[PDB]
Design a protein around this ligand. Structure first.
Ligand SMILES: *[C@@H]1O[C@H](CO[C@@H]2O[C@@H](C)[C@@H](O)[C@@H](O)[C@@H]2O)[C@@H](O)[C@H](O)[C@H]1NC(C)=O
Ligand SMILES: *[C@@H]1O[C@H](CO[C@@H]2O[C@@H](C)[C@@H](O)[C@@H](O)[C@@H]2O)[C@@H](O)[C@H](O)[C@H]1NC(C)=O
Ligand SMILES: *[C@@H]1O[C@H](CO[C@@H]2O[C@@H](C)[C@@H](O)[C@@H](O)[C@@H]2O)[C@@H](O)[C@H](O)[C@H]1NC(C)=O
Lengths: 319, 170, 170, 319, 170, 319
């Protein structure tokens, strides 16, 4: 007559590592490292990404005639970035401070186009000037959101824009860099011009950079494209005597602090939702670590270079 | 046949720690429910703490277009490596250490069973030293059950046991 | 009445680990000064190491006026989250683990007392298995004191004890 | 006759957490997380902060007539920042590189105003010109530390500044941006001007940005404000033919490496001293962690998001 | 003369854990090869894991010429302190903790030897409580060797031992 | 007849620290903190550093006449930086964006000088103009890699550079900033000039900054030095009517991602090779931590401020 004290052993084939031994068989264990995605770009806590498809972000905001599609996305949780999107700047030129503009627009909340002035209030000037290089419907046109102003005979003109909101106001405009003095006098009626932005006491004077560039799309002149954000309850006063392509429409917006982001991904947008997103797909992030991708957006398990992390829960499985 | 000293039992399928008994009426395995359940509560607590306590900040990362500003590039790249080294090394070793403890925990738990039983039997049994006890008196099912319930009475089998000891001595 | 197995004693107010004794002259609690003091030195060392070893660099932080430069903003903000995640998670688990060990340390220390006493008494006493010993001979204050000093003499009480054993057997 | 082995239990109500259990009662424990401030802005290791009260840092350094108060703070351990301080730029304009200037002046050691040249040595020019927009005592004046130079009839003039010290020399100056050519010729006697800073071989050419801004404080012209630090044993040579508001006084200084900082706080300066300072108050930093504030200055416990961290020191308190 | 309880032995020079024996033919030390070897494999594993698992990223650092751009300077300087605090504090405590465990590991290993021997001898020997056993029968080299091999036979010395017990009792 | 269970003790004098005790003697232990260098600057995984000796990086790339020595280092793993290297810009001026250029050239793989155009194809202009301030062999000369172009009578001229490679092309050029209009008309035949870089649609217009600086090396005019990298399969078109010191030679290169670096060290280059390099010397980096130097290049043990880290391996050494 005997009685013995013993413990469970089992058919389980999992092994684990410890300080003192390698690959010790156990009756049970738990993976604490997430190692698979879902291969889709998803909305993020139910807020979807911005999908510009064939347009650039700059093209879209300027109001390129080819971007006249996606609906007024009132909000977005991050931006799907396209590296080669055909529809960008129709009139050739430079865009000043794109990277900061992308960071500003990376995740935003209320986003509404707004009119900033009437060109048909203006006197002794021509407005809505047009070019072949930005065509609407076979007919020459221009950016939806900018107004090209000309023919002021070297005389000054003005525009007050206001932001009456408790939220910022995004502005885009351009300076026309003419090909020689001959064209400078033709359009604006002088050899040289100036444009001044007044933000109360602060000021900026833009002058055009005259001279002939390479011919591109039949043009040897260029436009330099600018953006700025105008703060809550705030006014700017612009005076120019030429070369200003003025800001007709802007956008009220609100940025979220832990701000969205920028994703370069081959994958297409999906109906699905997640808390954590990578260029490779989305993650079940209830686990504390992951080895899928270093570049993530959201609430994410930490990235580690392990191939797995088994926590023992059971007992040494020696039958 | 043998106890924990020689390994674990395929046969015991209703818990972690328990007994194997041998008498005239037969034999069988029985898990110690109380001691198993207590260990399960604890291991679950450990695992849940290691998982649930990772509640991380909203991050977002940048893979840029940028032989444009560099000094920031390089700083961002150095920072990503630094973080990577930290989490990889620490959490590797964390798993190694925590696993060690878990296994020790189970060893400690099993020995405790043995020590609790041994303390009841005293010299009414002979410690075979392999995790089994050879009883010096006959033990029916109610006897065995008393040991498993921790209610075995030392005095009540003392006399039958002492004779058997002196028989061994002759 | 009962020993460590059933819990700790309200009554013992002069240290961590000790004894409760029972005889004809009376009863009382007595802390084992040497074993208590040794554990205190050690725990203080642990706590002091966890506190004193944090000797941190001169830092300073910036909450700016700045939708002006951004790329650096965003990098600074990502770095603050990263650091936060690191310290929060690691030091949470640090406290959890260190606390576990401390309690194990105290359990290990108490069992050692019991094992040290048991080894002196051998079969001159009966291990009741609840942290108490039933002596098989009469034990005056000097007897009790010898056990607490680790100077109890096994041979000197052997004979009185053996008779009492055989009385149990009859 | 018995003898038992046992352990202490107690009236203590502290509990602690462990890997295996939640809220285990113990006979004693220790908080290792600091969780309270003192609600004051203090000096830092006995070096006090810089307190500009109603002036801006720019206003102060330029020598605005309204800043003529705080004593020559020879040193400071960080700067208390005011967001709306009335006394800033009296003559309207732009300040170039404020954020770098704040970082430079964030913690400094020996700080002494020094004269850089004599205007009354100069010939064929008027100096100390004055304006209503920077009034002294009802009477029009100008910045204490800058000298406005005019009336040179389009002819060049010069100024060598020296730093003979083994420590840096902080410089402020301005360029007058005139409202039209008419005023350009009136003041400086030409249509266009130039100002050149020579730092040995390195050089900088400033030209004014002519044109009319918004009228502010009766002015349609502006000044652009500049700063620079001149290194030990070093010389600059300035030549200008107009539009220079010159640097008359500068400051020797020494920056501390683990440099002070910038604090936005509502709290007022106090006599008290600390090793660690936050916008919420100061910290007893002998503990290794704190949960008061993420933004700290000095030698500080690490910030964690725990509500407390109890180390067990005693025993399981089960009576 | 005395066992592990009073400290370690200068004399034993062929391993970590072992025995000291005393009989008529003479005396001597002998390391327990199996138990030593097992512990060595394990400690080497621990040390190697702590060393080999640090496989770090290609970094590079900048000590610039630069009261030129500052905001990035200051950020880079704050980051270097942050990393420094992390590694210094964590790895200090890592060494402290790991060292603690290593020493416990060795204590646990030695007690196991004692427990394994004790379980073979039972009442054929008297636990002197200092890590030595006083045998109640005469023990030649083959007897001693059987204990060290774990093949000592309890039954075969039972009778000679029991007489000696009762002699003690008289 | 007795048998005892015991353990090893030893003559070893190492001690170690633990949670519960200070300086506990053990029979054996292991240093896991590397604490010594080799006092040399080494090549890095067998790729050596760039050693410009007495030249500056700018001097070298421009093709200063004094740099005409080191062989075409086809590659390098990082740069040894000299703070005072005499041979830098021979014709006095400014270098625009040095820090980014150093970062770009910090570690590079294939590096081959390449010709970008022929000056002797050009018409109605003088090329290879020379100055005393950049002497070859007592005789006046000019930078090897730049060509100074003059005498175009205010008429425009052109240069297409191509990068036909799948790797970047490094370019250096300069703009001549003339001392007054008199010299402007003498050299280039007009009062004012323009130079335009066309990178497809993108463009840059450089105009010179006229006026007299301090005389240095007999010159009151200056040159502003520029660099740029031209991407794979790419073209720039340059048109100028003056003041262009043109780019005659460039360099194809390939940057390594975990890029080399910049080392300020007093030590000289050595034949030795290492995986980890510091300003103090190289490191046996098979250990996980080091306390030698915070500023390292390569695959390095982490830097900690400990004086040693002893892992116990043996037993408590209490005889
Ligand atoms: C801005 O938007 C917040 C969220 O709006 C809701 O979700 C988005 C995606 C839309 O579907 C919208 O129509 C929903 O109402 C609002 O909570 C908030 O009112 C808005 N705030 C302002 C100032 O417009
Ligand atoms: C600069 O200042 C250092 C500290 O000066 C002392 O403390 C400050 C707050 C003042 O009260 C001052 O009068 C004290 O002497 C000096 O150690 C050092 O001499 C000074 N160095 C130079 C180059 O001026
Ligand atoms: C560029 O260089 C790589 C490495 O080249 C080898 O090592 C250097 C240090 C030289 O000694 C060189 O002659 C050796 O061949 C090559 O693997 C690779 O072919 C090269 N790639 C290109 C595009 O030129």
């Amino acid at each position: 007559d005997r009685i013995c004290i013993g413990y469970q052993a089992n058919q389980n084939n999992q092994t684990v590592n410890t300080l003192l031994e390698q690959n010790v068989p156990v009756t049970g264990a738990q993976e604490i490292l997430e190692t698979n995605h879902n291969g889709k770009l998803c909305s993020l806590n139910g807020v979807p990404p911005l999908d510009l498809q064939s347009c650039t972000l700059a093209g879209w905001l300027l109001g390129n005639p080819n971007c006249d599609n996606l609906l007024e996305a009132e909000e977005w949780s991050y931006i799907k970035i396209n590296e080669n999107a055909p529809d960008d700047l129709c009139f050739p030129g430079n865009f000043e401070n794109l990277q900061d503009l992308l960071l500003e627009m990376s995740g935003v909340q209320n986003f509404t186009k707004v009119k900033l002035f009437n060109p048909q209030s203006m006197t002794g000037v021509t407005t809505n000037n047009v070019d072949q290089t930005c065509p609407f419907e076979g007919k020459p046109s221009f950016y939806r959101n900018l107004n090209w102003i000309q023919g002021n005979s070297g005389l000054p003109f003005n525009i007050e824009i206001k932001n009456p909101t408790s939220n910022p106001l995004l502005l885009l405009w351009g300076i026309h860099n003419t090909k020689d003095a001959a064209q400078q006098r033709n359009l604006y009626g002088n050899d040289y011009s100036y444009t001044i932005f007044n933000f109360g006491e602060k000021s900026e004077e833009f002058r055009p950079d005259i001279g002939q560039r390479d011919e591109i799309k039949a043009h040897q002149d260029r436009i330099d494209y600018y953006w700025g954000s105008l703060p809550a309850q705030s006014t700017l006063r612009i005076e120019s005597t030429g070369n200003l392509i003025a800001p007709e429409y802007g956008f009220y917006y609100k940025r979220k602090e832990g701000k969205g982001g920028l994703m370069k991904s081959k994958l297409p947008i999906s109906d699905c939702s997640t808390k954590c997103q990578t260029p490779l797909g989305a993650l079940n992030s209830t686990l504390p670590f992951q080895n899928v991708h270093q570049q993530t957006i959201g609430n994410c398990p930490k990235y580690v270079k392990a191939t797995s992390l088994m926590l023992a829960t059971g007992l040494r499985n020696n039958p | 046949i043998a106890g924990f000293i020689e390994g674990g039992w395929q046969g015991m399928i209703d818990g972690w720690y328990g007994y194997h008994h041998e008498n005239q009426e037969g034999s069988g395995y029985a898990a110690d429910k109380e001691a198993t359940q207590k260990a399960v509560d604890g291991i679950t607590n450990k695992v849940n703490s290691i998982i649930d306590k990772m509640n991380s900040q909203f991050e977002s990362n940048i893979k840029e277009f940028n032989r444009l500003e560099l000094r920031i590039q390089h700083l961002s790249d150095r920072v990503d490596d630094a973080l990577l080294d930290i989490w990889s090394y620490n959490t590797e070793l964390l798993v190694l250490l925590e696993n060690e403890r878990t296994l020790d925990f189970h060893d400690a738990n099993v020995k405790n069973l043995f020590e609790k039983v041994k303390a009841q039997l005293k010299d009414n049994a002979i410690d075979e030293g392999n995790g089994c006890f050879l009883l010096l008196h006959k033990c029916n099912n109610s006897c065995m059950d008393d040991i498993k319930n921790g209610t075995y009475k030392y005095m009540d089998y003392r006399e039958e046991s002492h004779i058997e000891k002196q028989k061994i001595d002759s």
